[PDB]
Swiss-Prot record:
Signal peptide range: none
Modification comment: The N-terminus is blocked.
Subunit comment: Component of the SPC110 complex containing at least CMD1, SPC29, SPC42 and SCP110. Interacts with SPC110.
Documented effect of changing D20A: Highly reduced affinity for Ca(2+)
Record-level Gene Ontology MF annotations: calcium ion binding; calcium-dependent protein binding; enzyme regulator activity; mitogen-activated protein kinase binding
Binding, Ca(2+) 2: D56, D58, N60, Q62, E67
Record keyword Calcium present: yes
Role: Calmodulin mediates the control of a large number of enzymes, ion channels and other proteins by Ca(2+). Among the enzymes to be stimulated by the calmodulin-Ca(2+) complex are a number of protein kinases and phosphatases. Component of the spindle pole body (SPB) required for the proper execution of spindle pole body (SPB) duplication.
Other noteworthy facts: This protein has three functional calcium-binding sites.
Provenance organism: Saccharomyces cerevisiae (strain ATCC 204508 / S288c) (Baker's yeast)
Protein name: Calmodulin
List of residues binding Ca(2+) 1: D20, D22, N24, S26, E31
One GO cellular component term noted in the UniProt record for this chain: myosin I complex
Length: 128
């Protein structure tokens, strides 16, 4: 399947929980950051909002169950949406597929480890 189905969503409902503390469905740079700080790095709130800005379609400072998954839908034949964002979330795609799924976002949640970088595909390091 090359599209998100009730299955994938049903699978994402989990991967999300991992990032969802109150399990409300909406994640805030605060909570999201709380996940990173646990990973290894410690992104600043203002530094997170930067990442939450992209995921944010309106800038409410919240990631909807649709948006979050959108980060994976971003991919598409024609480039009618920021695809450079998929480069940052590529860390999850160690198989270098260019696309990440729920089982991948949930598998990464654990697969995480110091041995991780955003230079996976990103030709040039955003932060030279
Ligand atoms: Ca949450
Ligand atoms: Ca939003
Ligand atoms: Ca993949």
């Amino acid at each position: 399947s090359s599209n998100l189905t009730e299955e994938q969503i049903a699978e994402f409902k989990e991967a999300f929980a991992l990032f969802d503390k109150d399990n409300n469905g909406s994640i805030s740079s605060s909570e999201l950051a709380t996940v990173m700080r646990s990973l290894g790095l410690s992104p600043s709130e203002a530094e997170v909002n930067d990442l939450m800005n992209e995921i944010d379609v309106d800038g409410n400072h919240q990631i909807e169950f649709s948006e979050f998954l959108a980060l994976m839908s971003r991919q598409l034949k024609s480039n009618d949406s920021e695809q450079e964002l998929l480069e940052a979330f590529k860390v999850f795609d160690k198989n270098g597929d260019g696309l990440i799924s729920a089982a991948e976002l949930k598998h990464v949640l654990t697969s995480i480890g110091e041995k991780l970088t955003d230079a996976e595909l990103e030709h040039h390091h955003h932060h030279h």
